[PDB]
Curated annotation (Swiss-Prot):
Database matches in Gene3D superfamilies: SGNH hydrolase
Pfam families listed in its UniProt record: Lipase_GDSL_2
Induction: By zinc.
Catalytic activity, EC: 3.1.1.-
Compartments where located: Secreted
InterPro entries: SEST-like (IPR037460), SGNH_hydro (IPR013830), SGNH_hydro_sf (IPR036514)
A biological process from GO: lipid metabolic process
The protein's enzyme class: hydrolase
Disulfide bonds: 31-61, 114-138, 194-252
MF annotations from Gene Ontology: carboxylic ester hydrolase activity
Keywords: Disulfide bond, Hydrolase, Secreted, Serine esterase, Signal
Gene Ontology terms: cellular component: extracellular region
Name under which the protein is recorded: Esterase
Gene of this entry: estA
Length: 302
């Protein structure tokens, strides 16, 4: 029995950094949606356990904010405007899975704030929150400064928009089981580990980000995780808590790492260049994602 499914989301579903990309040569090339993202791999796995997903659309795309679910996404450099992701839903859609949220909080703006290196031209969307405040001071800015209230404002828009995401799904695909996928843990409980470069790497997991800012960044990820859990519980959705189980598969777990480093090379080649991971899941991280999601779908379909 086919289970009509829609995959949606941001760079953590599109799996920015994994190549080859789908639609290489068309407008959606700028989505940086790998051919083998967690949705692709989860369908495979499930198929050989006998769960047959009839995938109707996989509209995840890098840089998607929560409201891109209901608004047009503008791709970089004039590629175009993509239709709202909600448009992929059908009345007969029975399963919807994706990760939306990090870009509404502006986890990218928090990384760029904490790093001068990230403040120079890159393929990571966003602007520092306080661009005059200095990179090196970022763990103060967010903990005691202006950043600290900025965060409570971002977190309030997040809570409101996730509820709205969940209600629009409910509205267009009334029979759909909703699966909100969480983000993998970026920084480990023991930050000392980030002080080493990963076997074979020359740059540190988080480049120039002050070591002191490292535990704040995790605090903020935890938070976003609790916001996503809540939103799902209150909205009738299921949640895949990737954060709780990637505690030893962070960006700082050397060779067991499931997050490529900030400046580490991804598999993405633009002219004759590798594009950095920018802290997105790597191959290992993508298999965890796949495994955990496939796990959860299986559970829910039984």
């Amino acid at each position: 029995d086919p289970v009509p499914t829609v995959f949606f989301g941001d760079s953590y579903t599109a799996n920015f950094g994994i190549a080859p990309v789908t639609n290489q040569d068309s407008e959606r090339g700028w989505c940086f949606q790998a051919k083998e993202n967690y949705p692709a791999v989860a369908t495979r796995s499930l198929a050989d356990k006998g769960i047959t997903l009839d995938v109707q659309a996989d509209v995840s795309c890098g840089g998607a904010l929560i409201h891109h679910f209901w608004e047009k996404q503008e791709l970089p450099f004039g590629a175009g405007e993509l239709p709202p992701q909600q448009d992929a839903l059908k009345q007969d859609t029975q399963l919807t899975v994706g990760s939306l949220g990090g870009n509404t909080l502006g986890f990218n703006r928090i990384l760029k704030q904490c790093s001068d290196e990230l403040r120079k031209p890159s393929l990571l969307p966003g602007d520092p929150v306080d661009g005059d405040e200095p990179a090196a001071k970022c763990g103060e800015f967010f903990g005691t400064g202006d950043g600290k209230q900025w965060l409570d404002d971002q977190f309030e828009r997040v809570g409101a928009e996730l509820e709205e995401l969940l209600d629009r799904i409910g509205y267009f695909a009334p029979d759909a089981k909703r699966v909100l996928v969480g983000y993998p843990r970026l920084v480990p409980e023991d930050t000392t580990k980030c002080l080493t470069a990963a076997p074979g790497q020359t740059q540190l997991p988080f480049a120039d980000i002050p070591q002191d800012a490292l535990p704040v960044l995790d605090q903020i990820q935890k938070r976003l995780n609790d916001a996503m859990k809540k939103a799902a519980a209150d909205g009738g959705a299921d949640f895949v808590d990737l954060y709780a189980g990637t505690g030893a598969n962070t960006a700082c777990d050397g060779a067991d790492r499931g997050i490529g480093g900030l400046l580490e090379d991804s598999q993405l080649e633009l002219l004759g260049t590798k594009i950095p991971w920018y802290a997105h899941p790597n191959d290992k991280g993508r298999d965890i994602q796949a495994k955990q999601v496939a796990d959860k779908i299986e559970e829910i379909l039984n």
